[PDB]
Design a protein around this ligand. Structure first.
Ligand SMILES: [Mn+2]
Length: 278
């Protein structure tokens, strides 16, 4: 079987939905772990060295800071667009502070379903190229999978468009939902910008509190993977409740709610549409 390596559980789950049991799949960043600044273990080094095909997010998720993915593919003698592929190729990139320069791409593309569809298309393309015997199987699965994501995308856009505009604001700790905001027409507000060193300072908290007091947003949200003390403080200082915990960097453990890219996004979209209609 084709030996495939995915850098994280989101990419691995999309790959499973396209390839099923036709491949030997290894995921580096485990469920619930941080896909930025991760430290690969010897098993990840060995599996990457043996892989036929490697999938990574790109757009600086795994190549910024410690550049753990760059070190991994360099030590494995794997070549870009031959052995390893960025599944984000083709997304309409967002840049930090709206400044279009290499290195300023915002990595959080999968938080809108159109980009999850692009990820899937890139995965199906490269699986079909490396394993042409299963090309028809991968294309059938790609069509079924992207139909499922597209239906969820259309339903959620219809729900957000109904929400009174004065309520439509997605508030999270990190500014990680800019792709979500662009796709769904829901502006973002947050405590700290992407790549901030000190997360949840008194200055950051005070700044968001002052912004939110001038809005009618009825609910705040908090990422399940972050320390919730900064958002709890914002919630108490603004008197706006935290409606739900939401997924950002990972799917959930198998058997739990949100244990796939689709179910993670359905959970987020359901909780945010519900919370903002309050
Ligand atoms: Mn992030």
């Amino acid at each position: 079987k084709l030996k495939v390596v995915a850098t994280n559980s989101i990419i691995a789950d999309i790959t499973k939905n396209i390839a099923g049991d036709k491949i030997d799949l290894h995921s580096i960043v485990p469920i619930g772990q941080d896909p930025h600044e991760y430290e690969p273990l010897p098993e990840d080094v060995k599996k990457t060295s043996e892989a036929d095909l490697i999938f990574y997010n790109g757009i600086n998720l795994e190549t910024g800071g410690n550049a753990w993915f760059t070190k991994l593919v360099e030590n494995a003698k794997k070549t870009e667009n031959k052995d390893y592929f960025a599944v984000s190729d083709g997304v309409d990139v967002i840049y930090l502070e709206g400044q279009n320069e290499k290195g300023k791409e915002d990595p959080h593309a999968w938080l809108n379903l159109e980009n999850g569809i692009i990820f899937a298309k890139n995965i199906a393309k490269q699986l079909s190229a490396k394993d042409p015997n299963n090309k028809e199987f991968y294309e059938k699965n790609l069509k079924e999978y992207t139909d499922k994501l597209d239906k969820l995308d259309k339903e959620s856009k219809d729900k957000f468009n109904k929400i009174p505009a004065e309520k439509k604001l997605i508030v999270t700790s990190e500014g990680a939902f800019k792709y979500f905001s662009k796709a769904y027409g829901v502006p973002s507000a947050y405590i700290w910008e992407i790549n901030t060193e000190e997360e949840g300072t008194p200055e950051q908290i005070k700044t968001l509190v002052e912004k939110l007091r001038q809005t009618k947003v009825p609910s705040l949200f908090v990422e399940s993977s972050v320390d919730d003390r900064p958002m709890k403080t914002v919630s108490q200082d603004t008197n706006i409740p935290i409606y739900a915990q939401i997924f950002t960097n990972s799917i959930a453990e198998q058997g739990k709610e949100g244990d796939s890219y689709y179910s993670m996004m359905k959970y987020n979209l359901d909780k945010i549409a519900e919370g903002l209609a309050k």
